[PDB]
Amino acid sequence: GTSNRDWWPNQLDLSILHRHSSLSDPMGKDFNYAQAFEKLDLAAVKRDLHALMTTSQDWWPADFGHYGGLFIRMAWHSAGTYRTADGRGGAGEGQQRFAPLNSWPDNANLDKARRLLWPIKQKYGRAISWADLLILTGNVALESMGFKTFGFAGGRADTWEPEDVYFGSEKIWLELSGGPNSRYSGDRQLENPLAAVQMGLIYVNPEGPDGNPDPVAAARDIRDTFARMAMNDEETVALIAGGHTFGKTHGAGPASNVGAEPEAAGIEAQGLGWKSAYRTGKGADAITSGLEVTWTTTPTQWSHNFFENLFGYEWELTKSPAGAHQWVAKGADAVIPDAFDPSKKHRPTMLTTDLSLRFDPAYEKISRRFHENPEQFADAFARAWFKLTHRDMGPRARYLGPEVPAEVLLWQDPIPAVDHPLIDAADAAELKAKVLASGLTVSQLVSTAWAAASTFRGSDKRGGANGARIRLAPQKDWEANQPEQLAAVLETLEAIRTAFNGAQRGGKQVSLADLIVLAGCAGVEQAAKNAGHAVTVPFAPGRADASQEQTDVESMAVLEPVADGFRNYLKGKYRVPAEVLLVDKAQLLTLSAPEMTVLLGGLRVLGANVGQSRHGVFTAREQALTNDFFVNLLDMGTEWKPTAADADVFEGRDRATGELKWTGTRVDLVFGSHSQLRALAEVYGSADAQEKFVRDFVAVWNKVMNLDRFDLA
C-alpha cells in the first residue's frame, strides 16, 4: 500500500506531535502512576526479584545458575540509549520493550531477560511500570551479587508506543562508517544528536572502531560516546569495570546460526527472537554478541578481580568461536569458571574495549587508582550506576519511594527548597503593576520569559524556568537569549524584586525565577489590553533560584537552543530544514500541532523574535495580542518568492502592484504551505477566531511556563 511518506518522503512529519494520545494508552485518562507506585510494596517486589535471580528457566538457562549479569546488562542497555544532545533515549520510558530497541543487535537476548520478568510484572500490575522494573531488577541483581547500590527512585511511567527518535540514517544494521549515510565525517566526528558508533549499538563496538581491535583508538570512541551520554572519564571507567565484574558474553558458535530479531520473527515466537540453530541454542551454547569472554573468577559475586586481571596479565589477540576479535591472558592458568560445566575452567579474557581502560593514558591512571583503592572504585561505580539509571528522570521532585538517595547531585540540576511564604494574588497584581510601570516593553517581558521557560525538554525533563538559570552562566550568554537585552531586563526585574522583598514582613519573598515568569504574564496581559481585550494569564508561584555552583555549565550547554523557530532563530546553517527543527523543538516542549501553531503566531506579533527581526511579523500592531499572523499569512493578495541573496528568506509582495509587504523564513511560511499546518492556521485566521486565538494562546503560554513544575504536578 503506497503511503504519503512514499510519495513525498521529505515532507514534514507532524505525527510525532500527536504521539502518546489518550487513544493508544490503555490506562484511564485519570490514571496516576505516581500514586500507584507509592502504594506498591517495594520490599515484596525486591524479595521476588531476589528469588528470580537463581530460578533458572529451561528455555533460557541461567549462566552460573544466576541471572544477575544478564539483568545488569539489561538495565545498563535500558539506560544506555540516552543522548545528552536531545535528552532522548534512556530508561525513563521503558522503550526497550518496543521497536526498534527491542530488536537492536546490541539488545539481543534481552528479550529473554524481559520475559523472565513477566511473572513479577503481572503479579504487581500497574503499581510497577516496566520502566521502573527494568532498573529495579538491575539494582537487585547487583545487591544479590554483593554490591551495595547508592539508591533507587521509582516514577518512570510506562509509555505505550515507540518514541520518535532519530538513531541515524543508515539502512543497514551495524553499518561501518564512511557509507552513504555515514554518521561520521572529518576526523571521526560523530554527527549530533547521535551517541553511538554504529546503527543498533548502545555506545561502541566491543571489537574496536569499525571492527579494528586497537584499544587505544577504541578508547577514543568510548570517551566520545560516554561523554555524549553525560559521563566523564571517572564515571566511564567505573561503569565499564563495574559492569564487567559480572557475568559473561555469549559467542559459542557462528553468528549465522542466529535467526530473526523479535520484530522480524514469526508470530509463533510470541515476541521473542534471535532463535539459534547452534546446538541447544541457549545456555552453554548461547550466542548473543559473538564474543566469548568471562571477566572474573567469580562472575556472580562482586570482586576486585576485573582490575587484578586487566593489569596482572599481558594480552594476546585471538578470536571467539564465532570469529570475533577478543583477548586472552598470555601464560595464564585456567582460573575462570565455566557457566555450565563444573569440570571446565578457562583463561582470563577481555574485550578490546576493556583493554582501553589500561592502554588509554587517561583511563590508565583512573584504572590504577581503582585497582589500588577498591573502595574508591566501589563508590564511584555505585554513584555512576545511579546517575546512569536516573539521568533522564528530571528534577528530584519526580523521584518516588523509600530508597531515594538524600544526597543532592550536581547532575540533577538541583533547585533549592522553598522555606518561606509565597506571594499571593494581591502580591502578583502589585508586582505586575510594578513591572508594567518600569518601562519594560511587551516584547522584552515576553521574550525574557520565553527564553527562561522554553529550555525545558520532556525527553529528559531538564530545563525550564524554575531555578532562574537564565541569569547564570551559560544561559545568560546564549546568543538566542540576546545577552545585552537580557541583562537590562534582569537588572530591572532584580531591582523590583529587591524593593518588594525588602518591604515584606514575615519571611515572605519572591524568587527571581517566579518574577521572570510573572513579568512574562504581565506582558501577555498588556498585549491583550493593547488589542482591546481583558485577559487573565494564570500564574503559579513556587519556583526558587538556583546558584551558579548548583549549575554545571558544561552540562547546561546541551540545552542551548541553536534553532528555535518560536523566536525565528537559527544559529547557523544546518542540513535539516528549519521547519523540521521547529517540529523537533515543539516535540521537546510537549506541544501538539495546534499548540505549536497558536504559540508561534502569537509570539511573532508580541515581538519575541531574536534581534527584533521583522521575519514573520505579519501585523501593523506589534505588541498587541491578535491573530494577525494568521490572517495576513493566509491572504491570497500576497505572493511569496525566495530572495536572490538567501533562498531561506522569502518576500511577500502585493500580487497586483509588486509592492513588498512582508518577509518571512521557512518557519513562518510552512504554516501556509504544509497542508495540515495550513488547515490549523485557517482556524485561527478566520473572522470568528480572535477570542479563540487569545484563549488558546494564553493556555499554551501557561503550559510552557509550567513545564518543569513537578513540585505542583
- Can residue 26 be called a binding residue for a second copy (CB under 8 A)? yes
**At 663, which helix (H) or strand (E)?**
strand 660-665
Q: Which is nearer to a second copy, 272 or 357 (CB)?
A: 272
Q: Is 462 helix (H, G, I), strand (E, B) or coil?
A: strand
Report the interhelical angle of 593-606 vs 578-588 (nearest 10°): 110
- Interface characters, 620-649, with a second copy (x: CB under 8 A): -----------x--x-x--xxxx-------
Residue 37 CB, nearest distance to a second copy (Å)? 13
Residue 454 CB, nearest distance to Na ion (Å)? 18
Asked if 262 and 102 count as a contact pair (C-beta separation under 8 A), the reply is yes
Q: Which of 276, 289, 475, 482 binds ligand HEM (CB under 6 A)?
A: 289
Q: Which of 460, 545, 564, 668 binds Na ion (CB under 5 A)?
A: 460
Residues sharing a CB contact under 8 Å with residue 283, sequence separation 6 or more, in sequence order? 60, 61, 63, 339, 340
288 makes contact, choosing from a second copy, Na ion, ligand HEM, none, with CB < 5 to 8 Å by partner type, with ligand HEM
Q: Is 77 a catalytic residue?
A: yes
- Can residue 73 be called a binding residue for ligand HEM (CB under 6 A)? yes
Distance CA 382, CA 360 (A): 23
- Can residue 70 be called a binding residue for ligand HEM (CB under 6 A)? yes
Among 18, 20, 50, 77, the one annotated catalytic: 77
Residue 622 CB, nearest distance to a second copy (Å)? 23
460 makes contact, choosing from a second copy, Na ion, ligand HEM, none, with CB < 5 to 8 Å by partner type, with Na ion
One-character DSSP codes across 611-653: GG--TT---SSTTS--SHHHHHHT-TTEEEEE-SS-TTEEEEE
Distance CA 628, CA 639 (A): 17
- Can residue 295 be called a binding residue for ligand HEM (CB under 6 A)? no
Asked if 397 and 31 count as a contact pair (C-beta separation under 8 A), the reply is no
How many alpha carbons lie under 13 Å from residue 67 in its C-beta half-sphere? 27
346 is annotated as contributing to ligand binding:
no
Distance CA 434, CA 593 (A): 35
- Can residue 574 be called a binding residue for a second copy (CB under 8 A)? no
Using CB under 6 A, which residues numbered 325 to 384 contact ligand HEM?
A: 351, 353
In our burial notation (b when 16+ CB lie closer than 10 A, e otherwise), range 364-391 reads bebbeebbeeeeebbebbbbbbbbbbbb
641 makes contact, choosing from a second copy, Na ion, ligand HEM, none, with CB < 5 to 8 Å by partner type, with a second copy
Asked if 377 and 370 count as a contact pair (C-beta separation under 8 A), the reply is yes
Distance CA 537, CA 535 (A): 7
- Can residue 279 be called a binding residue for a second copy (CB under 8 A)? no
Residue 649 CB, nearest distance to a second copy (Å)? 11
Q: Is 657 helix (H, G, I), strand (E, B) or coil?
A: coil
- Can residue 47 be called a binding residue for a second copy (CB under 8 A)? no
Residue 90 CB, nearest distance to Na ion (Å)? 4
Residue 617 CB, nearest distance to a second copy (Å)? 18
Using CB under 6 A, which residues numbered 19 to 38 contact ligand HEM?
A: none
Using CB under 5 A, which residues numbered 376 to 415 contact Na ion?
A: 392
- Can residue 125 be called a binding residue for a second copy (CB under 8 A)? yes
- Can residue 687 be called a binding residue for a second copy (CB under 8 A)? yes
The one-letter amino acid at 607 = G
- Which residues are part of a known binding site for heme b? 244
Residues identified as active-site: 77
Interface residues with ligand HEM (CB under 6 A)?
Answer: 63, 69-70, 72-73, 76, 203-204, 206, 222, 239-240, 242-244, 246-250, 288-289, 291, 351, 353
